[PDB]
Specification:
Layout: H1 11-14, H2 23-38, H3 41-48, H4 50-53, H5 65-68, H6 75-84, H7 95-101, H8 105-109, E1 110-114, E2 125-127, E3 136-139, E4 147-153, E5 159-165, E6 171-177, E7 182-188, E8 194-198, E9 215-219, E10 224-229, E11 233-235, E12 237-238, E13 252-254, E14 262-264, E15 277-281, E16 285-288, H9 303-306, E17 310-315, E18 319-323, E19 328-332, E20 339-344, H10 346-349, E21 359-362, E22 367-371, E23 376-381, E24 387-392, E25 400-404, E26 412-416, E27 426-430, H11 433-459
Antiparallel strand pairs: 1-27, 2-3, 3-4, 4-5, 6-7, 7-8, 9-10, 10-12, 11-13, 14-15, 15-16, 17-18, 18-19, 19-20, 21-22, 22-23, 23-24, 25-26, 26-27
PDB class: hydrolase
Keywords: Cryo-EM, Parkinson's disease, Kinase, lrrk2, Rab GTPases, hydrolase
Entry title: Cryo-EM structure of Rab12-LRRK2 complex in the LRRK2 dimer state
Length: about 450
C-alpha cells in the first residue's frame, strides 16, 4: 500500500507509478508544510473536491498561498516550498538539508521581504502614525538628483511615488498631531526646503521657514519638533506650529559650526531623570532638555576611526557612537565622560575590506542592532557578552535600520538594504530575534540530548 493517499502524493507516484525515491517523502513534506502555511484550507477544499486534491496536484502549479488564503507572508519558507515542490526529484533537497534550512532562526523570525523599483535608492525611511489601518512606510529617493517622496504600503505593498524637490531628501520626519487628529509628515530635503504633507491630505503641502543650510536630521520626540541643520541650529517647533506656514524657531540651539552637521537627535530610556535629550554634532556630543540648552558637552575626539564626523548617538546607561567608515563603536559614559569600552565590527565579522557600522538601532533591554557597511547585521547582547549572531546574505549594504510599530504586530525591525542593478530591498524582521536565536538554540540541543539518550537505549 505504498502508493499512498492520492491527495498527498508525489507526481512520480501518480504519473506512471515509477519506483519511489526517498524524495517523495520530501514532496509530501512540502505538501504538509503547504497545509501548515495555509491552515489546511486546501485539505478541507479537497475533502469536497477530491479531483482538486489529487488530479489537480498532477502539476507543481500549486498557487500563491498568500493570494489564495489570508496568511502572513513568511517568505523564507515560501522559497523552501518552491524548492521542495519541484517536479524533478533530483532538484528537491535531501531531508537533512531541509532540516538544516528549518534550523535557521532567521526563518522563524523574518516576517516578509519586499523588492522595490529597478534602481531606486532611499536615504530616509519613516513609519506611519502606527494606526491599525494607517500602516505604511514612507520613502525618500536618492537614485536621482530630484528628490521624490514615495508612499509605500505594507498590507498590500504598493509603490506610490511623488515628486518632492530638486535635491534628494536626505532626511524625513513625521508626527501624528493629536490636534485635529492629523498625520503631519514634514520633508526637509538636502536643499533646505522644509515642505510638509498630511498623510491623509495629500494636498496639504506647505513650506515652513526655510532651513538656512543643509538639513541633516530631523526628529519628533508638550510635544515639540527637532531639526538638525548643518549649522547645528536646533529650530524648535510644535505640532500645531508646523500646521501653518512658517513656524517660529522657538529655540535656536546653534551649537556647532556649519562645518559640524548635526547627525542625530536621540531620546532617553528612563523617567525619573525626566528624559534628558541628546545629540551629536560634528564629533563632540551634547545634550539638552525641555529648557533646550547644552546640559553636558562631552568631548569625543586609527585617526579617522577615533576622529571623524559622528553618525549617531543612542541613549542608554552608556552611549554608543559610530563614525563615518569606522569599524568600531565607542562606548561612552554620560557621567564619567570617558571611553568605557570598545566594540570593533571586524573583531566579529572576520570570524565567519568592506563593512563598517552604519546604523545603530537599540532594543529596549537585551539587544543592540548594528548595521554594517556590507550586507551584514550584528546583534549584540549589550549587557554581558557581545556577539550572538551575524545575519548576512540577505542584502548588500544596510542603508537605514529603524524599529517601528506597524501592522498590529508591533516592535518590528524595518531593516533596509540594497542588492547590487541595485535592487533596494526592505526586510521586516521581528524584534524578538535575539530571544529566538537562543531559544531555538537551546531547544535544538535539548532535542539532540533526548535523541542521543534514547538512541543508546536501542542497543541496551
Amino acid at each position: 500500500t505504498s502508493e499512498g493517499t492520492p491527495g498527498f502524493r508525489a507526481p512520480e507516484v501518480a504519473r506512471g507509478n515509477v519506483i519511489y525515491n526517498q524524495q517523495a517523502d520530501v514532496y509530501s513534506f512540502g505538501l504538509l508544510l503547504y497545509d501548515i502555511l495555509t491552515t489546511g484550507g486546501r485539505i478541507v477544499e479537497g475533502l469536497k473536491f477530491p479531483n482538486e486534491f489529487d488530479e489537480l496536484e498532477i502539476q507543481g502549479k500549486l498557487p500563491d498561498p498568500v493570494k489564495e488564503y489570508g496568511c502572513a507572508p513568511w517568505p523564507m519558507v515560501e522559497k523552501l516550498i518552491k524548492q521542495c515542490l519541484k517536479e524533478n526529484p533530483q532538484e528537491r533537497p535531501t531531508s537533512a538539508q531541509v532540516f538544516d534550512i528549518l534550523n535557521s532562526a532567521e526563518l522563524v523570525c523574518l516576517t516578509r521581504r519586499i523588492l522595490l523599483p529597478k534602481n531606486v535608492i532611499v536615504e530616509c525611511m519613516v513609519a506611519t502614525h502606527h494606526n491599525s489601518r494607517n500602516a505604511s512606510i514612507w520613502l525618500g529617493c536618492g537614485h536621482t538628483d530630484r528628490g521624490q517622496l514615495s508612499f509605500l504600503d505594507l498590507n498590500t505593498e504598493g509603490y506610490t511615488s511623488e515628486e518632492v524637490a530638486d535635491s534628494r531628501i536626505l532626511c524625513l520626519a513625521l508626527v501624528h498631531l493629536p490636534v485635529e487628529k492629523e498625520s503631519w509628515i514634514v520633508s526637509g530635503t538636502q536643499s533646505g526646503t522644509l515642505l510638509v504633507i498630511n498623510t491623509e491630505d495629500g494636498k496639504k503641502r506647505h513650506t515652513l521657514e526655510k532651513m538656512t543650510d543643509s538639513v541633516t536630521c530631523l526628529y519628533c520626540n508638550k510635544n515639540f519638533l527637532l531639526v538638525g541643520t548643518a549649522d547645528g541650529k536646533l529650530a524648535i517647533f510644535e505640532d500645531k506650529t508646523v500646521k501653518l506656514k512658517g513656524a517660529a524657531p522657538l529655540k535656536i540651539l546653534n551649537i556647532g559650526n556649519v562645518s559640524t552637521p548635526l547627525m542625530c537627535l536621540s531620546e532617553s530610556t528612563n523617567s525619573t531623570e525626566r528624559n534628558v535629550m541628546w545629540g551629536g554634532c560634528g564629533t563632540k556630543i551634547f545634550s539638552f532638555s525641555n529648557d533646550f540648552t547644552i546640559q553636558k558637552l562631552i568631548e569625543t575626539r586609527y585617526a579617522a576611526f577615533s576622529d571623524s564626523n559622528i553618525i549617531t548617538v543612542v541613549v542608554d546607561t552608556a552611549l554608543y557612537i559610530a563614525k563615518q567608515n569606522s569599524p568600531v563603536v565607542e562606548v561612552w559614559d554620560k557621567k564619567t565622560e570617558k571611553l568605557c569600552g570598545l566594540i570593533d565590527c571586524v573583531h566579529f565579522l572576520r570570524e565567519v575590506y568592506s563593512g563598517r557600522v552604519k546604523t545603530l538601532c537599540l532594543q529596549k533591554n537585551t539587544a543592540l542592532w548594528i548595521g554594517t557597511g556590507g550586507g551584514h547585521i550584528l546583534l549584540l547582547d549589550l549587557s554581558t557578552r557581545r556577539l550572538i549572531r551575524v545575519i548576512y546574505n540577505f542584502c548588500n549594504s544596510v542603508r537605514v535600520m529603524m524599529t517601528a510599530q506597524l501592522g498590529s504586530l508591533k516592535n518590528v525591525m524595518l531593516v533596509l538594504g540594497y542588492n547590487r542593478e541595485i535592487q533596494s530591498c526592505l526586510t521586516v524582521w521581528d524584534i524578538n530575534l535575539p530571544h529566538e536565536v537562543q531559544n531555538l538554540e537551546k531547544h535544538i540541543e535539548v532535542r539532540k540530548e533526548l535523541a542521543e539518550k534514547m538512541r543508546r537505549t536501542s542497543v541496551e
